[PDB]
Amino acid sequence: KSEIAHRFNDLGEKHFKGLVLVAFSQYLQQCPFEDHVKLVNEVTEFAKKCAADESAENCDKSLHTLFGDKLCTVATLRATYGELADCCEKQEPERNECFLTHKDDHPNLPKLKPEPDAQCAAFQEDPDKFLGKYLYEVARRHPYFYGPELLFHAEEYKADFTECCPADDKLACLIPKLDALKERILLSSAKERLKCSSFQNFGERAVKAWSVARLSQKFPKADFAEVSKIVTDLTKVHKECCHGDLLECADDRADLAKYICEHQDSISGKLKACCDKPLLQKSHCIAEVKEDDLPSDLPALAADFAEDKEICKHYKDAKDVFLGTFLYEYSRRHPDYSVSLLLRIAKTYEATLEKCCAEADPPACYRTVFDQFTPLVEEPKSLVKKNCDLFEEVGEYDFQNALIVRYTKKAPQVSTPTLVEIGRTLGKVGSRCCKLPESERLPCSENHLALALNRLCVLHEKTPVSEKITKCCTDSLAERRPCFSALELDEGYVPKEFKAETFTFHADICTLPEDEKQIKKQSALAELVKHKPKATKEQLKTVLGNFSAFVAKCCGREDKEACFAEEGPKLVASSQLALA
């Protein structure tokens, strides 16, 4: 009826305003905070005026016409987003499509730094404005963040400041919390970007297959009917969020959380905890829920999926069902596999049937089908064991450095900040996954690599530089990791010209936190590879150890700058000799 009334009634003023603030920040990432808050109140007012009189003018326009109209009222649009004004000429959905495409995955804004005194200050004098700002800062940095999940984090962030602002020593309560939360924002953001990237680049059918694999591992006791239903509904939730439809996305999400809690007995014993919780906790808890124990009545699969003579007839009849069922069954018994491994096994199952059923004796052919999955399984298992050995041997920083070398060799045309960001994210896959019980390491590692590879692809979408990267990013979602693992030193590379200043250090580096010192060195390392692509990881490890030693020394000196100045250029030249 009035779609905007309806959502307002369903969501209530607070959340309504929340999600409307996020939406606007993510669509207009540059606008001062004040204008968004203003645009938000205006829509909220119209919403209220509509809830009271659904028959009133323009109350029956769709949401996107309404928000699209509000965004296009914003002043200096053509100075702030010269590229956006254009979308404003268009109708809907054309208009929305246009804003979407214009979203910025790397607006490269200032780092959100916890200034606890000035933040506790700002919080006390106005809690609503302080939290609203938080949503804006985060939304505009992560224009595809899972809308409703941000309202959830903003609660945590509120609890953070509520506990630490009266607390004794302020920063030491608050700074480990805000760092922890930031880590969760970044992972959360990555998980969602992969979902939306999957919608954009591979379509729903791919998003559903992913979801079937995953939800079956999590809910191995639910039947297939029940899995299909949730996947159907969840896909619709994320489709909407990814399309910028946040109010509908949230409303649909609450519906699904309620469905799931009505049925937790047919779904999972692990939901109990989640279901006893308030709305936003509940959804978050369901979203992040752990895998239930395997039922003791899992069916052998030989019979229907390898022995049956009718398989061909069954498969031809309705492929997507028979295959979905296969995927449901294989995944439910394999929480020890990664989602992409499962999706790879499903394409091989499928590929094997396409093949065998075309042959004169399909049953003699498809009978060994499960034995084709073996190589699929051991390849990633050994790749994880290998990288976990290396990691436990050399620790995060060196593991990252090995990854930054590996990736700069694979894609030397990518900018150093990106190679560094990625190599660093990749290395944190080790820290996270390698310490886990052994059978969890494969799924952790690959599911996490998916997130980081997709981040590389996303950046690469805005700034394309390498064809090998394009190919891996666009070929097959399921083959993405194996496609990247397979790249080697790009042989067509032309060593970047040497530029002394790049590798020249100064005293300023001395008062950066460790975290930031590393990035400085790690950038130099990428630069070392670009200029000398053929040097082995071992030569680079040694040369960088020298650079590290030189920095420690000079920063420790009475005269830091004469140290850097006298020692640097010598180390700069001799180090090229070691990279021959």
Ligand SMILES: COc1ccc2cc([C@H](C)C(=O)O)ccc2c1
């Ligand atoms: C309902 O059966 C399916 C449907 C689509 C799929 C897609 C993929 C990967 C993600 C792809 O690259 O398209 C894998 C397995 C699938 C099984």
Ligand SMILES: COc1ccc2cc([C@H](C)C(=O)O)ccc2c1
């Ligand atoms: C368990 O820890 C890891 C961490 C990073 C990894 C990166 C890669 C990439 C895809 C590569 O190109 O080799 C593979 C495996 C990995 C396992």
